[PDB]
Symmetry: D2
Subunit: 223 residues, 4 copies
């Protein structure tokens, strides 16, 4: 009566499992998760990567707290180069990037970068891969697309926790905002979805969901 | 600025989407979900199918309520043939099965069948496919196995709801009981798992999870 | 260095890429691949597992074969119990099975078992998993079904290899016979398919195909 | 009837199994498949998309080609803007792109664009998705990576077809060159792999392979 399974070695992305180590000035673990990066933006010019990058420091000032410090320093340097310390959940490394906030690049905001304050540890894990999408499903109507989209978070009206299925029944009548990364645009976007367990198809979204090493946002072979 | 997606037709299992219709004597929608069926058991001899079958009626007596009616009728007919009306979430049809409860078949109980009272609508949907399993993960240690196992429910100490991810953080210290169907044994079994977000790998279980039409319990082509 | 990937351990089935073993009494690697096992058959009664079992010996006689020896020993013991040595690609072990061939069981053959002569090494690898299936596709019409079906072989002449894609080009207009395992019936069947690159959908079959550890025939956790 | 499956609608990409179209000025189906596009290149500046773009015309001249016409028109307008007609297998549309070939951009070629002459119909189909990759496998050593890599072609002589499996048998001992798209870099690269059936793991590459709608190169929702 022995196991019919054994162990084998496989390649996995470096930004998985237990990270040794972190090397973060300021010593914190939270920072500003870079989500959407607009076209022709200072954030773009600075090479901020959607989903993978975290702004952890500006001009030497560590960003441990969810306040107005980052927004004030940008507002105080509106056309001047600013230095940012960037943490990558992909390379697990820190890099210095120059960025110049501006009102003159024609988009919304001073960075052209949508951010959210959160922790960057196991942030490469909390990803839900959109698989198949039924016709006329809530997922379809909201703009979710099969296989190209990965759900990476939500605008949390109400509060509970973070895993995905644990939101869509609780928003059974109310619209839900989702953070959706796309592997063609390599960018996040806002999707507003109206969950319905009785829409007339699978689940409350009408789409499949994958989680795990088979369902992560892709990474290049080399740094 | 038009959609890069269109609609195409694909084959899906009949026991999906919206069922027309139900045809259930007694008119209810709840019944006894057949889980584990033991070897050489009356339940086996009667052809009860794990996961797909629901006991809805016994000797004409409809089982709408989660009480002792079923257990008493079996106990009152301990070596006599009993008639059961069976609903299949696979065929969406009703069938009559003869079953003879007994103390003499050598196993545990009178049917050799583990059951749970619940609803049989969209019951083919609430399935979580175990994908990859890391070495020494909580999933590994509990007995979950890659690709062959499908999580179909839990013994719900505490209460919340039914989707899977919405349990494993709340049992961060306490063991969790899972109902696990296996596509080799075609049978359910009890798995006790100790969720840990800090075990040193992906998620709290250390396994991948698939949900949807790509991650259902398989069905034969024809009835 | 610069690689963004590392190595991690995962559970995989015992019957995997490690080329072991043989250790077969009589010496060899070839035997009789058990495909279809009919209901209510002597073969079923003997516990022969479709796809996983290989008949290696009958009454001490090694089957280095593909002649009439097997059908002749069964004919000579036509209603008497015979000993078979069985090899399992699942357990990687040999077992003795008793089976009683008969003229009386009403089905085809003396065992009710469809068999084929071949080698049993890496036979758990040689499997193509049917993924999605388009409507009105060649796959659909032939009877292939999404996710429940695994193509485990074909009629091999010209001799070639065993590969599936390099079969669909040479049968670009006339039908191909496929051996298809279904994880619900736990049994093989013959599917005749007519490849057509211009049917009006993906490929020549109109179905997706998976290969590898994510796409094998499922295995129970314990022997 | 007896079928346990039915039909359902799902979203799929526009560039799918429906054989449309052509409607190409100059008439044809062949052109220059844009593979690698180098960083800081005239080609990059012109917005040429790796894998999805086909160069069909330069300055009104149709490329029914695979001769030196393209390299010659680029040489004759060596630092001047030229008009290119581009076909997209993603949008199924034609667009005019301006590009200025140069001797001065420091990279290889006048465009910094690796190209190949072929037909653009069902080219979104001819993709093999790399799934899991074993350690020390041929796939690993050559540089193939799990889930982020898609094999989109090979060096085609003998002429054959384009298929991947029926390439790995004929290069059973000497190396094979593969064109590999990565969904992080959004770019192609050359991978040289040495197939070995006895490397000591699954298949001859040591990786899983997916084919079909579940395994295509991702597409953005809108054009």
């Amino acid at each position: 009566s022995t196991s019919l399974y054994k162990k084998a070695g496989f390649l996995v992305p470096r930004g998985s499992g237990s990270s040794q180590s972190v090397e973060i000035p300021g010593g914190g673990t939270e920072g500003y998760h870079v989500l959407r990066v607009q076209e022709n933006s200072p954030g773009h010019r600075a090479g901020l990567e959607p989903f993978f990058d975290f702004i952890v420091s500006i001009n030497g000032s560590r960003l441990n707290k969810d306040n107005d410090t980052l927004k004030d320093l940008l507002k105080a340097n509106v056309e001047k180069p600013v230095k940012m310390l960037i943490y990558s959940s992909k390379t697990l490394e820190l890099r210095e990037a120059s960025v110049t906030p501006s009102n003159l690049w024609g988009g919304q905001g001073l960075l052209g970068v949508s951010i959210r304050f959160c922790s960057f540890d196991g942030a490469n894990e909390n990803v839900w891969h959109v698989l198949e999408v039924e016709s006329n499903s809530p997922a379809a109507l909201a703009g979710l697309r099969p296989h190209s989209d990965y759900i990476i978070g939500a605008d949390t009206v109400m509060n509970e926790s973070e895993d995905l299925f644990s939101l869509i029944e609780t928003h059974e009548a109310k619209p839900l905002k989702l953070y959706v990364y796309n592997t063609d645009t390599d960018n996040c976007r806002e999707v507003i979805i109206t969950p319905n367990s009785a829409w007339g198809g699978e689940g409350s979204l009408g789409c499949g969901i994958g989680y795990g090493y088979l369902h992560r946002i892709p990474t290049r072979p080399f740094e």
